[PDB]
């Protein structure tokens, strides 16, 4: 069964700003999500140095980019540390609160939306291009969960009984109608090369059938 939660006030305010501000340089969403995946991969890689069994749920450390024109979705998959239920409901939003406040202050003082990563809240940049985001995640210490949000101030969390992923996170971006450029192989390649050139894990761009 699905549980529905309110976003913290400042996160809801940040998401409305992201959705409502006129800002053409939308492509930076992809950099932010790849950077989040790389950080999650660093985390499990470090933990495995002291406890090799943390990789029993999958030794490969990588990022896949999976466009689907038919469903109008771009999926970013990583085999990083993953997130617990408590992360999804409480921790991620709590940790993001100070960064959100700082970022919104910087935007009033002349910063632009592309600088969002410097405040550590880059995940929310997904709403530059997606009308709905689904996050499927599995941490070694918890069950597999699905977080989901179309913004408007709330998000849901439920257990995920779909195909078991082993460990990591899958972000499914349900793209806005006018943002289908981010499903084109040429465009994704261009963006990865521009902004994500030096990420230290293989990034595989899947091709469509």
Ligand X SMILES: Oc1cc(O)cc(Oc2ccc(Cl)c(Cl)c2)c1
Residues that bind ligand X (CB under 6 A): 33, 36-37, 40, 78, 80, 92, 123, 135, 147, 169, 171
126/183 with CB nearer ligand X: 126
91 is in an annotated binding site: yes
User: Among 183, 205, 92, which residue's Cα sits nearest to residue 129?
Assistant: 183
30/183 with CB nearer ligand X: 30
3-state secondary structure of 111: coil
**Are 82 and 36 spatial neighbours (Cβ–Cβ below 8 Å)?**
no
17/92 with CB nearer ligand X: 92
Q: Please state, in angstroms and rounded to a whole number, the distance separating the CA atoms of residues 34 and 63.
A: 8
Q: Please state, in angstroms and rounded to a whole number, the distance separating the CA atoms of residues 158 and 175.
A: 22
3-state secondary structure of 10: helix
169 is in an annotated binding site: yes
Min dist CB 110 to ligand X, Å, is 26
78 is in an annotated binding site: yes
Provide CB contacts within 8 A for 8, sequence distance 6+.
93, 94, 97
68 is in an annotated binding site: no
Min dist CB 126 to ligand X, Å, is 7
203/209 with CB nearer ligand X: 203
**Tokens read off for 182:** 């981010």
104 is in an annotated binding site: no
Min dist CB 147 to ligand X, Å, is 5
Q: Please state, in angstroms and rounded to a whole number, the distance separating the CA atoms of residues 84 and 87.
A: 5
Min dist CB 41 to ligand X, Å, is 8
Q: Which residues are annotated as a binding site for ATP?
A: 32, 36, 78, 83, 91, 97-99, 118-123, 169
């Amino acid at each position: 069964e699905v549980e529905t939660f309110a976003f913290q006030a400042e996160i809801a305010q940040l998401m409305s700003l992201i959705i409502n501000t006129f800002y053409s340089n939308k492509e930076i969403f992809l950099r932010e999500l790849i950077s989040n995946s790389s950080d999650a991969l660093d985390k499990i890689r470090y933990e495995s140095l002291t406890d090799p069994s943390k990789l029993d749920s999958g030794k490969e450390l990588h990022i896949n980019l999976i466009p689907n024109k038919q469903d109008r979705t771009l999926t970013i998959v990583d085999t990083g540390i993953g997130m617990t239920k408590a992360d999804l409901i409480n921790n991620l939003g709590t940790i993001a609160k100070s960064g959100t406040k700082a970022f919104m202050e910087a935007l009033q003082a002349g910063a632009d939306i592309s600088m969002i990563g410097q405040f550590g809240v880059g995940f929310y940049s997904a709403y530059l291009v997606a009308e709905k985001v689904t996050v499927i995640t599995k941490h070694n210490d918890d069950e597999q969960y699905a977080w989901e949000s179309s913004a408007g101030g709330s998000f849901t969390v439920r257990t995920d009984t779909g195909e078991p992923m082993g460990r990591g996170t899958k972000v499914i971006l349900h793209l806005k109608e006018d943002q289908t450029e981010y499903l084109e192989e040429r465009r994704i390649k261009e963006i990865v090369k521009k902004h994500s050139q030096f990420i230290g894990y293989p990034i595989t761009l899947f091709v469509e059938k």
